[PDB]
Design a protein around this nucleic acid. Sequence first.
RNA 1: UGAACUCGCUGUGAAGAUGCAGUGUACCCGCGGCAAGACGGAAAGACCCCGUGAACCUUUACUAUAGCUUGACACUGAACA
Length: 75
Amino acid sequence: MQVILLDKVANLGSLGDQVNVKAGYARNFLVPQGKAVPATKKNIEFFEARRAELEAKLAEVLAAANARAEKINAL
RNA sequence: UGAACUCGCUGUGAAGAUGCAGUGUACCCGCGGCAAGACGGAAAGACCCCGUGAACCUUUACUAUAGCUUGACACUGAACA
Ligand SMILES: [Mg+2]
Ligand SMILES: [Mg+2]
Ligand SMILES: [Mg+2]
């Protein structure tokens, strides 16, 4: 079963990672206890949309934080 | 219970005759008795064989199968050596 991890999970991956796993592990533990979700394409697009929007916020925050770093040495 | 005007003998004859041939005997009709015969009555022989019949029963007959048992996969996962 392909699933996308929610919280970080030992031996698998961190939040957002995509991993294959045995159905029974996903069905009876990881999903009920809120640790992962199926790898539905809407979902993986959801997270690709997430990874990229998060990437933009990290690129632009770095564009804002650099700007203030040029201004610190400016004074 | 085919119809009877329904005797003996010896012989003949699907080969054990009231009914055929030959012959003997016998006037017509009951009643009480007897069971030698009518291969008497009753039951499409149960023995025996036959039918490429039936059934039930047995088994190391054949073919299947419930059940019991084997392993693979599924429900069925994690960590650690
Ligand atoms: Mg007669
Ligand atoms: Mg008789
Ligand atoms: Mg008969």
